[PDB]
Amino acid sequence: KLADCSSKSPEECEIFLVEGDSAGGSTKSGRDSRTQAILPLRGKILNVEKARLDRILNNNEIRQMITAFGTGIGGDFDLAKARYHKIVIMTDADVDGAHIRTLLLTFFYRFMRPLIEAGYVYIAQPPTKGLGEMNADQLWETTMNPEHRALLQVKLEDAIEADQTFEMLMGDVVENRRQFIEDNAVYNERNITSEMRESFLDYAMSVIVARALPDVRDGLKPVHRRILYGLNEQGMTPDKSYKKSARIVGDVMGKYHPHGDSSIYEAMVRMAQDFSYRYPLVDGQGNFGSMDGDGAAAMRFTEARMTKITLELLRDINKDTIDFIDNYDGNEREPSVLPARFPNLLANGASGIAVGMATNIPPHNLTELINGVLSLSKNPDISIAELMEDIEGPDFPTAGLILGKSGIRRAYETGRGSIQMRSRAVIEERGGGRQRIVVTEIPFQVNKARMIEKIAELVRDKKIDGITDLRDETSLRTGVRVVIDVRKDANASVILNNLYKQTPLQTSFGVNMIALVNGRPKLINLKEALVHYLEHQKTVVRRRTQYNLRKAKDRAHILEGLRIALDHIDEIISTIRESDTDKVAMESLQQRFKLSEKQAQAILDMRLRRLTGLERDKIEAEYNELLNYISELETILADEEVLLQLVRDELTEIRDRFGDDRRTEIQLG
Amino acid sequence: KLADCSSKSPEECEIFLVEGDSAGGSTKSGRDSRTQAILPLRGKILNVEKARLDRILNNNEIRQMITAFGTGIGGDFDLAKARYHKIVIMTDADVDGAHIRTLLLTFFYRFMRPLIEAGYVYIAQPPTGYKGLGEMNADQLWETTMNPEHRALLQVKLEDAIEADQTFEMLMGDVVENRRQFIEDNANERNITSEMRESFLDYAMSVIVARALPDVRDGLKPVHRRILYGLNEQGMTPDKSYKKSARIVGDVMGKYHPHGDSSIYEAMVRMAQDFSYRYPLVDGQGNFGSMDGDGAAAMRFTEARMTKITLELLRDINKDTIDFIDNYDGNEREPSVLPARFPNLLANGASGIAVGMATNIPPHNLTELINGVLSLSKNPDISIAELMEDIEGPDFPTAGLILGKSGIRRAYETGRGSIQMRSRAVIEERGGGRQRIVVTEIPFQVNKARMIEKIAELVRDKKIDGITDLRDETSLRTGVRVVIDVRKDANASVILNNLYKQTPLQTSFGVNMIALVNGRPKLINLKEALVHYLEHQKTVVRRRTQYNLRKAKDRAHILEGLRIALDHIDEIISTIRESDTDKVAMESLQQRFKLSEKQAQAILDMRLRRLTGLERDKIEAEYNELLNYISELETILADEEVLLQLVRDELTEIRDRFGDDRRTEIQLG
DNA sequence: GTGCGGT
DNA sequence: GCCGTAG
DNA sequence: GTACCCACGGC
DNA sequence: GTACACCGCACA
Numbered sequence A: 001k002l003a004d005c006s007s008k009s010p011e012e013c014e015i016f017l018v019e020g021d022s023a024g025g026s027t028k029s030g031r032d033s034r035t036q037a038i039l040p041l042r043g044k045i046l047n048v049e050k051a052r053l054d055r056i057l058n059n060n061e062i063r064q065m066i067t068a069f070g071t072g073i074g075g076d077f078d079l080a081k082a083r084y085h086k087i088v089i090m091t092d093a094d095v096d097g098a099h100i101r102t103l104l105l106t107f108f109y110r111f112m113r114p115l116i117e118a119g120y121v122y123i124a125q126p127p128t129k130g131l132g133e134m135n136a137d138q139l140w141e142t143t144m145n146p147e148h149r150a151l152l153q154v155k156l157e158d159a160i161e162a163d164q165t166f167e168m169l170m171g172d173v174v175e176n177r178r179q180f181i182e183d184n185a186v187y188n189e190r191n192i193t194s195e196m197r198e199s200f201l202d203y204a205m206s207v208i209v210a211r212a213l214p215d216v217r218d219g220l221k222p223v224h225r226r227i228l229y230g231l232n233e234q235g236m237t238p239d240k241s242y243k244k245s246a247r248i249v250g251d252v253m254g255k256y257h258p259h260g261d262s263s264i265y266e267a268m269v270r271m272a273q274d275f276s277y278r279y280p281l282v283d284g285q286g287n288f289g290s291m292d293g294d295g296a297a298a299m300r301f302t303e304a305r306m307t308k309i310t311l312e313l314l315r316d317i318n319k320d321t322i323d324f325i326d327n328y329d330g331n332e333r334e335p336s337v338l339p340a341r342f343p344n345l346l347a348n349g350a351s352g353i354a355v356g357m358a359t360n361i362p363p364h365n366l367t368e369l370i371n372g373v374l375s376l377s378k379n380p381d382i383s384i385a386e387l388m389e390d391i392e393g394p395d396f397p398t399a400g401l402i403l404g405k406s407g408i409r410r411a412y413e414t415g416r417g418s419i420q421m422r423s424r425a426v427i428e429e430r431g432g433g434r435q436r437i438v439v440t441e442i443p444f445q446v447n448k449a450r451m452i453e454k455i456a457e458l459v460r461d462k463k464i465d466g467i468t469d470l471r472d473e474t475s476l477r478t479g480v481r482v483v484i485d486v487r488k489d490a491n492a493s494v495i496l497n498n499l500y501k502q503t504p505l506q507t508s509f510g511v512n513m514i515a516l517v518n519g520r521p522k523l524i525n526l527k528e529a530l531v532h533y534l535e536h537q538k539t540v541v542r543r544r545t546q547y548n549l550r551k552a553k554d555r556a557h558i559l560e561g562l563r564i565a566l567d568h569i570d571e572i573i574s575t576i577r578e579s580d581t582d583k584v585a586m587e588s589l590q591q592r593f594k595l596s597e598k599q600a601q602a603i604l605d606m607r608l609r610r611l612t613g614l615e616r617d618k619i620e621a622e623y624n625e626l627l628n629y630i631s632e633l634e635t636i637l638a639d640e641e642v643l644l645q646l647v648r649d650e651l652t653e654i655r656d657r658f659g660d661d662r663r664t665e666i667q668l669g
Numbered sequence B: 001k002l003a004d005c006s007s008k009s010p011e012e013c014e015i016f017l018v019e020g021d022s023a024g025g026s027t028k029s030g031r032d033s034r035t036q037a038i039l040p041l042r043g044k045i046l047n048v049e050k051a052r053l054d055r056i057l058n059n060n061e062i063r064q065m066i067t068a069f070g071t072g073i074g075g076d077f078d079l080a081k082a083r084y085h086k087i088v089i090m091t092d093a094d095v096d097g098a099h100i101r102t103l104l105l106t107f108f109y110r111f112m113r114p115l116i117e118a119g120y121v122y123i124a125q126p127p128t129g130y131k132g133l134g135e136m137n138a139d140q141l142w143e144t145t146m147n148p149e150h151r152a153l154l155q156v157k158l159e160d161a162i163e164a165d166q167t168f169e170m171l172m173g174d175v176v177e178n179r180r181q182f183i184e185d186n187a188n189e190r191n192i193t194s195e196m197r198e199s200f201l202d203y204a205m206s207v208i209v210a211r212a213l214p215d216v217r218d219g220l221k222p223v224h225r226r227i228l229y230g231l232n233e234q235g236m237t238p239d240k241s242y243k244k245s246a247r248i249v250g251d252v253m254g255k256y257h258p259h260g261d262s263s264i265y266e267a268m269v270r271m272a273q274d275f276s277y278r279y280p281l282v283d284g285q286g287n288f289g290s291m292d293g294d295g296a297a298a299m300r301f302t303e304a305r306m307t308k309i310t311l312e313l314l315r316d317i318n319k320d321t322i323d324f325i326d327n328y329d330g331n332e333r334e335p336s337v338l339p340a341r342f343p344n345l346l347a348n349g350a351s352g353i354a355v356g357m358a359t360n361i362p363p364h365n366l367t368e369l370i371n372g373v374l375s376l377s378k379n380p381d382i383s384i385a386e387l388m389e390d391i392e393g394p395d396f397p398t399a400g401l402i403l404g405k406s407g408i409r410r411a412y413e414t415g416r417g418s419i420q421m422r423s424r425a426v427i428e429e430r431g432g433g434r435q436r437i438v439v440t441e442i443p444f445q446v447n448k449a450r451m452i453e454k455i456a457e458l459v460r461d462k463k464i465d466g467i468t469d470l471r472d473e474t475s476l477r478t479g480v481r482v483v484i485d486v487r488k489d490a491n492a493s494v495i496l497n498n499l500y501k502q503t504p505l506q507t508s509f510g511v512n513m514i515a516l517v518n519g520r521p522k523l524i525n526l527k528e529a530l531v532h533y534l535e536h537q538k539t540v541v542r543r544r545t546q547y548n549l550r551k552a553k554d555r556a557h558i559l560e561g562l563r564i565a566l567d568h569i570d571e572i573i574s575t576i577r578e579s580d581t582d583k584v585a586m587e588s589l590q591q592r593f594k595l596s597e598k599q600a601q602a603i604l605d606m607r608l609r610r611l612t613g614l615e616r617d618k619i620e621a622e623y624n625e626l627l628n629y630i631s632e633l634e635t636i637l638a639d640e641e642v643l644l645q646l647v648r649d650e651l652t653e654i655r656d657r658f659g660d661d662r663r664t665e666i667q668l669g
Numbered sequence C: 001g002t003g004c005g006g007t
Numbered sequence D: 001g002c003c004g005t006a007g
Numbered sequence E: 001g002t003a004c005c006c007a008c009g010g011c
Numbered sequence F: 001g002t003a004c005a006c007c008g009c010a011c012a
């Protein structure tokens, strides 16, 4: 791993802790060959304030640094054997780079605290993006070159203060770490604390607001918007043909999302499972996993492409219904949020683990979710207990069962709640006084065979009894189906209701609805959830109708001047011929006909065949049809209750085209 | 990594060897746990024919199979002890799988031959030439290939004791010649030896034309061609900014080349190393490896575009210059050969290992190379040694020196020769009567690092005396420069003369100039190569000229149609007004103006803009000059010799523009 | 024991 | 201990 | 082209 | 994220 230096007298030495490997062997040619040692960390390291001392003492990066430090840790730290008087921490200049920073610091205050004081702790000044993508000496000259390199020694100033920060930030009290976050939510020396409060604040945020949280409008995280905008743009629409995966990842990684390949493929892969997603936004072709936890074949071996329902996610996008922004480097654009013409958030659900928070939303039945909004339009002052009159509860893709209106009903209420999910099981008598236990629908997010290696574990472990055999017989002809053989005399129902206890045959969805609303992290309710979506349904379908307006009048102006042109044809054709530079002609048609630049230019673009019979006539046939569209579009605008209908019209056309009954059963009791 | 059936009874039990990891995983999921137990193969196996036992045994894919079956190797063999009674070999309908299928066959015959006799050794028949096993679902893998209902298998029959041993020997044998020969000669139950022949052969063939064998005409292998083709389709010519490596490959792979991004990358990557390619065919961004032998960066982190010199490989390609082929899936088109407006093969070099053969080709200096072409183009009866007044021999990007003319000399005569690559070390003074050797240039293809290490390995191992320090001091200024101290008052030149014959300071280039000629593996001497090249160019300029002409012949024609109307215009204006459709309007213009169907449209489709003064003379000015062009072309076509000097000039301008000094120094005595 | 496109 | 996007 | 670490939060 | 191991030649 490490690459060491010739000078074995620490003084003229120093080690660089450099983020990745891509940037690690770059640095392995920029670096001086006799005064500069490199230690490539292989990825985000252990937290030393979360895990106890036997763990710390193990994660390889953690060990690897100790020896390579020489000083020895804890209370054996002889800062004398200190191999380096200048240890540089050269983390990428991204968020996961300041984030890797805090993690090394947390290790260098509790385990080499004298080191910080000593005067060896450093922070190279990488030029701003990305680390890896630099040359070997492009790495020497800005960062490892003493002649030109900008560094940072970490002054531990007030140990009383730091001692208190380091616990809040990397401590086990998630809730402390949030309170700070929420409060600071604005949208040649370096003090160790002056570092953390920023180097973690930026990360805490960007993770919350540009990683692990699904917007409230499209119900989408970024890595998803960017996979569904790219299917969009690359025009791999459902009527067309599957593209290989690594080609869309190729496209998406390039343009919008500078991150690992793995993160993007496995992400679009989920969007592609009839069991993961309630309403799959991807057409998977090729091996795409299975319920046993198996993973889609590698991105080079599969194909995807939009789904019919995905269009509704991006329908009317090009009519200016949402704001585009430059991408990451400013060479491309991307949607800030897609149209989401259909209740996507609650429909498909969500799960993500943040920094301060985490979110968990269940998948609900679209049809149910629609009436919900439908009713929700006709009454801004509606009660959840009523919204729930249209929305029985979530509906998992795994069907399965749900217990009580009660676990369900609090979630929606207050925002957080607990739902007990349970498998579809049946007892059936095999005669001769015998029994057997046949699950056909496990719960949602429940790895099939690991529930079975889980019952396998019990039976061989004599922790539960009276089961003779355990077969998976599941066929893509029967649906899920776990047959459990029961012994004679021994009671099965017993063995059933103990398999709910002891195994995932019964599991619980921890509803906790933190979605990104108005830009920030937010716990919300069923009412709130649809309200802010219905809002984005008003705020799309409106902005469109106005673009159609604009796009409408714009054409009827060009037409106006066009008909005038066909009506005084004979003079127009000579006022051109008798004009040399078309700059002059544009100057004629205007004065003589009371016309406008955009109009006289247009005429000067008219093709001879636009003068035949139909083509002439067709033309004015287009005009009188536009003015119905125009007044209408304005009718639509000058009466809320109309635009509002369009919304209901459309939200209902959807519910009639894609709606599907319920799979999950809500059992009352 | 074998997922064994619950079943413990051979008569019903059948193992599966699958092509990939992925293939394997789908198989494992669409398989019957009851009776179908699957052992996947990670890539390639071992040749138990070419390799000897200590080595076979210590190998994995064999042992893995050995335990699986649970029978025994060679004499230990016992038909009863066998876990399974169907051993199914599942590789895909791709040559590479054809050959793997012939690699496992090897095993079963050399070690479990008796096993074959019982009929346990089976072959699986996936759908033909559709795709990689891995593409299909697990359900798609069961329904066509594994389900006993609709599955077709080939039972391997050992027909003749006598011929089988020899055949296996020949195809998988140590002796190259007999495999080279067999190939060339050939240029339910299944007969195993007719199967080892065809599927091996079917494979061996692809690996030549469409694998690791440069074309004579463009110098390019399928893999590079393919990268350079698409570079030019994406349109990232040197003038355009870099665009990530991931996008590029994902693309070449998703339009042309069905293989490992890893293989595509490090191939594309080479093209971009100024020390790899005499004239780099790419222009990278970030870490693209370096001399001492560090691989390149991760295709995520890098960017890439053509060189200005690559522009000339794809000059005039969309001008009907060379035939087009359909891509592996028939969903896109690709060039069968890049136009190569410069002699790439002998320029950049090339060196792969095929089947029964292998090419190895040096680099030369473009300037030299062109001059030889011009002179040979001039004297098509020119003596080889007359070509050497122009072409003195190779020229490695690394530079260096060569040792003697008969070395180069017989290389260019029989296709093959041995060329002495030394280095340029200088001896000089370090101070105090103490000396030093200094090496500033290494043999091409020599790895600077492994050269330095493998010198210590001879001092430490006291196999070379008087060496008292050796650093490698290569910076960007020094370029290459390695220092070797000589214990003063000791003959530095006697060491240097030994380090030469001991290590990689001096290396043998074993030239075997083979490359696809008239579509087959040929051996060509300097001339043929130049000729084959030369003829390509003669056959390109002509076709371009053929195309530049039907394009002018076609545009003059129209330039007229317009003129015509532009003159007799008011009546033109009338014919159309007085007409109801373009149909009549045409058919009217066509006859009552003598206008061609073609010219008629050209007017029907003419904007008013061209009624003015200028626009009527921009036509005029354009029409006349198209006559002076067709003049030229009709001149260049109608003569074997102008077509021949257009080439000479056109190449005489490349050399003029991209041509450079010699770096490798040619010494004798 | 090594170059290069392949599983 | 695992739900999922990032080193 | 897959194996083997980490964070981050809730239950 | 490097480790990991194989076909295929020819020539030291």
Ligand SMILES: O=C(O)c1cn(C2CC2)c2cc(N3CCNCC3)c(F)cc2c1=O
Pocket (backbone or CB within 6 Å): B042, B043, B044, B260, B261, B262, B263, C007, E001, F004, F005
């Ligand atoms: O595309 C590639 O570069 C590789 C692909 N594969 C798998 C075959 C597709 C590899 C597999 C390797 N192993 C699997 C077989 N036994 C262990 C080693 C390997 F070492 C390297 C590679 C590649 O470089």
Ligand SMILES: O=C(O)c1cn(C2CC2)c2cc(N3CCNCC3)c(F)cc2c1=O
Pocket (backbone or CB within 6 Å): A020, A042, A043, A044, A260, A261, A262, A263, D007, E004, E005, F001
């Ligand atoms: O992009 C990714 O999925 C990964 C990237 N990296 C490095 C950051 C690029 C990893 C590094 C890992 N390590 C394994 C050995 N011990 C610590 C580092 C790892 F297990 C997984 C990954 C990835 O999955």
Ligand SMILES: [Mn+2]
Pocket (backbone or CB within 6 Å): A092, A094, A097, A130, A131
């Ligand atoms: Mn980064």
Ligand SMILES: [Mn+2]
Pocket (backbone or CB within 6 Å): A262
């Ligand atoms: Mn990963």
Ligand SMILES: [Mn+2]
Pocket (backbone or CB within 6 Å): B092, B094, B096, B097, B132
């Ligand atoms: Mn294949």
Ligand SMILES: [Mn+2]
Pocket (backbone or CB within 6 Å): B262, B263
């Ligand atoms: Mn590889």
